[PDB]
Each structure stands twice: as C-alpha cells, then as structure tokens.
C-alpha cells in the first residue's frame, strides 16, 4: 500500500481553442492512448486520455459563448479492460466505440453524446443514432460546473474507468459581482477511486467474486468499489494552499462509490453551488453527501489555519465500512502557501434567484431482473434500453417525475437536457409493494435539505423512497436518455431513452 500525501495535487490545464472568433470558439480533443504515473511509488501506468491527460483538459466556457468540440478517438482497436460480450446484443461492430457526454450540458440531441451515437477511430464506424463529427455546446444556461465522460453503450463503465473524465465550466460574467473566489483560488477536484496493480496497470475485475463456472468471462459486476483514492489522477494527494478562501469545483467522477466529505479538523465548507448552478443561499456545511456524477460547488475558507494540515476525509465505506488508512483520506491540504495577493473574494449569503403548471406525472419505479446467468440485471420501470421509448414529455412542459426506490441501496438518477428541482422524499413499505405494486407510505414527506433546493441534474434516491423531482423540458426536442450514474447499473441496464416532443 502507498504512502499518502506524498504527490502534489494535479491542476488540469485550460483547453485552449484551435480557432476562435467573436462568433464560435472551436476546440479538438483526442481519445489517446496514454501513460501518466499516478503516485511517486508506482510505475508508469497505461490509461485512456482525452489529449493523452489523465484527467482531461479543464475546458472554460462563457455562458452563452457559442462552443464547438471535435471529440476524436484515436485508441487502439481493441481494449485493455474486461469487456462483457453477453450484456448487448449485436455486421460486426468494433469491440473499442465512443462517445462525450457533457454532463450538464444544455445540449442539441445529436451533441449531447447518446450511446448509440458511438464511434471509433477517425469515425471509421458508427453507431446508428450518429449524426455529427463537432459537437455543438450552445452554453445558454446557468453558470455551472458541469463534466465531461464516455457515454458509448455497454461500454460507459469501462471507458470512463480507463480515464474519460474531464471538468467543463460554464462562467456567467453577471456572477463576477459576488466576488467569489476565482482564477488560481478556484479549482476542479475530480475524484476518481480505482485500484492499482503492483506493475502500475489498472485492475478493473473481470468478474464478481465466486465465478460459477457458468458464468461468462469476463463478466460484469454490478458495482466496483476502488481501494485507492484519486484526485485529479494522483493517488491521495496534498494540495498546498494559502489561507484564505479558495472554491472548489467537487466532482465525483467514480463508477460506483458515493463519498461522505468532511476535513478531519471538524471545520466546515461552504456550498454555494449545485450541479446546476449557484444556489439561491449558501449554506454552512460539516458534512456532505456526494454520488456519482453529483458535483458541489464549494467554499473552504483557509484564513485561520495557517501552517496546517487539513485532511479532506470520507466515512462513506463502498462494500464495507471505510477503512481509516485508506478510503477514509481523500486528500491534504497544506495551508503553507505564502498569500500572492489581499484575499479580496467573498462568501455571500445571497446568491441567485430561485409559476408552472404541472403537465404530466410520471411515476416510476427502480427495480431489477435477473438473466440467464444468474446475475442482477438493474431496470428503470420494467424497461429494457432498446424497449419502446415510454418517458415521452412535450418541449416547453412541466412534469412531476416521482421515482420510487425499493431496492436495497441508493441510485444517482440523472436526466439529460434538462436540470431539475426537488420536491420531497418520502419513506413506503418496500415488501408491501413488492407483494402487490401497492404503494403505502410510512412517514410524512420530506423537503430537500438546503443543498437540493437549488437545480439539480443527478439526484440521489434513496432506498425505500419515493423522491419526486419536477423539469420543464426543453429548451430543445429530440431524442435523450435518463438513467442510473452508477455505471456498473447503466451499462447493464439502467439507462432508458426519452423523447421529447414537438407538434
Ligand atoms: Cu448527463
Ligand atoms: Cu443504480
Ligand atoms: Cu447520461
């Protein structure tokens, strides 16, 4: 096992753009094959880079700011990780596919990377749902951190995992007046967790544990729990800091582990931001919750802690409680950097501003067959991927999406397109509606707590819950997906379409 604390914290460099003009900003990215050495102690490890970087180029947008990017994929045609043959079925299709999703991204159905709209190298095959080479990010949305990853069917947990991640903000100039913490004091932290081989190579299992000998090879697993933390491709780094107030753009870029965070001195954050932008109120926090693809946009004010160690510490286990010497740490900070300048960023209160009629109200339920083979197979609604489209909302509608959760652990539920508010949670009896499909609650309704009472565009819901969520839907139509950020779950096969229509 690897000492912590030992490698400087990684800062992704800014994209900078192959032509840009008043009127579009065009940007080229190429999935490579790439070697980066994830801690001092480890040799070299092989991974898959957008642009050969582990994590990808931080790309920084304006709202509004008319963006194009030319995703390549310029890998090996055939991949390094376990592939699962058995979960999709099929000419002959190239083993190695991609796709970008940016997540968050108010985007045009054929740019917001639909796993059918894969690829591979130099565009030399594609998928059925492909349209375009350039992907159109039209940016007319709220400043937010958003993220980019691999999106291609069968294939998201695996690609990803390989390092297909990479941040995307989005700065509305008319927040420049709250005076937050910005440039150098405002950094990305994605966290990956992943478990590494002696030789330095990625481990990703190829198959569960206790392999009936029935049971392909490799198979999928329905969750992977990593024994090293990352941040920003280094294993349990340090980040020197000055104190003062820094923002963190905090994105859980795992494939199945949700993290608890906390500093390790009982000093508190402040969030003043969601997945979908800033919340109205900043809000005080000891602790927070963070599921995969959920992303809290934060304050951690240095100021009187100068000389110390602060540890970022996590108390969410992934397969069994955490353990103390390994995925309790996340990071260190170091508040031993000298001040370059006045800290003159602020932490206000007041931050944003928070009339519809409801349309339509989908109710939905989370649950899971089991295949040929034995093994859980996770369903939205009963429904297979390539199953009849049945999530149909109307361009310029209002829904209530009440989603209800009988199964044994949470699922980060995510909507394409769109963000969305939270209205409540609320507790049922799970055997009761498991026996009859009767819905009985056991408690009251429950509000969000104050960081859900902004937007949202992956939400947590919760075991034996009905969370009910309410979109408006558009600004554009076409053809979208929903589905589970657990990509274990995704791939195999909570992930379904959604329409959205227009007369
Ligand atoms: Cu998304
Ligand atoms: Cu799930
Ligand atoms: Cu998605």
Known sequence: TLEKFVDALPIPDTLKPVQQSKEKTYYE???????????????????????????????????????????????????????????????????VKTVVHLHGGVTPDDSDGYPEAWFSKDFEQTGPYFKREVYHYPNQQRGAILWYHDHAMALTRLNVYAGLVGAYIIHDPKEKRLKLPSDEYDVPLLITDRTINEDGSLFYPSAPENPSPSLPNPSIVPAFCGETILVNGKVWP????????????????????????????????????????????????????????????????????????????????????????????????????????????????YLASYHERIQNIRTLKLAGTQDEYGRPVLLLNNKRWHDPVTETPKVGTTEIWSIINPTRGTHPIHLHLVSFRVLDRRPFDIARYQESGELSYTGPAVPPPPSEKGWKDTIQAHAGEVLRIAATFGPYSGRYVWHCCILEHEDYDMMRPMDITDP
């Open 238 to 349: 340090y980040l020197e800091v000055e104190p003062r107030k820094y923002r963190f753009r905090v994105i859980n870029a795992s494939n199945t582990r949700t993290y608890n965070l906390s500093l390790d001195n009982g000093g508190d954050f402040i969030q003043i931001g969601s997945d979908g932008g800033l919340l109205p109120r900043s809000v005080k926090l000891n602790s927070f919750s963070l599921a995969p693809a959920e992303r809290y946009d934060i304050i951690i004010d240095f100021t009187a802690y100068e000389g110390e160690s602060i540890i970022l510490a996590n108390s969410a286990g992934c397969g069994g409680d955490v353990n103390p010497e390994t995925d309790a740490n996340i990071m260190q900070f170091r508040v031993t950097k000298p001040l370059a300048q006045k800290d003159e960023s602020r932490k206000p209160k």
């Open 29 to 95: 990215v190429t999935m490579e094959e790439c070697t980066h050495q994830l801690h001092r102690d480890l040799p070299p490890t092989r991974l898959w880079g957008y642009n050969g970087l582990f994590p990808g180029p931080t790309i920084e947008v304006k709202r509004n700011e008319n963006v194009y990017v030319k995703w390549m994929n310029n890998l090996p045609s055939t991949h390094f990780l376990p592939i699962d043959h058995t979960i999709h079925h099929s000419h002959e299709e190239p083993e």
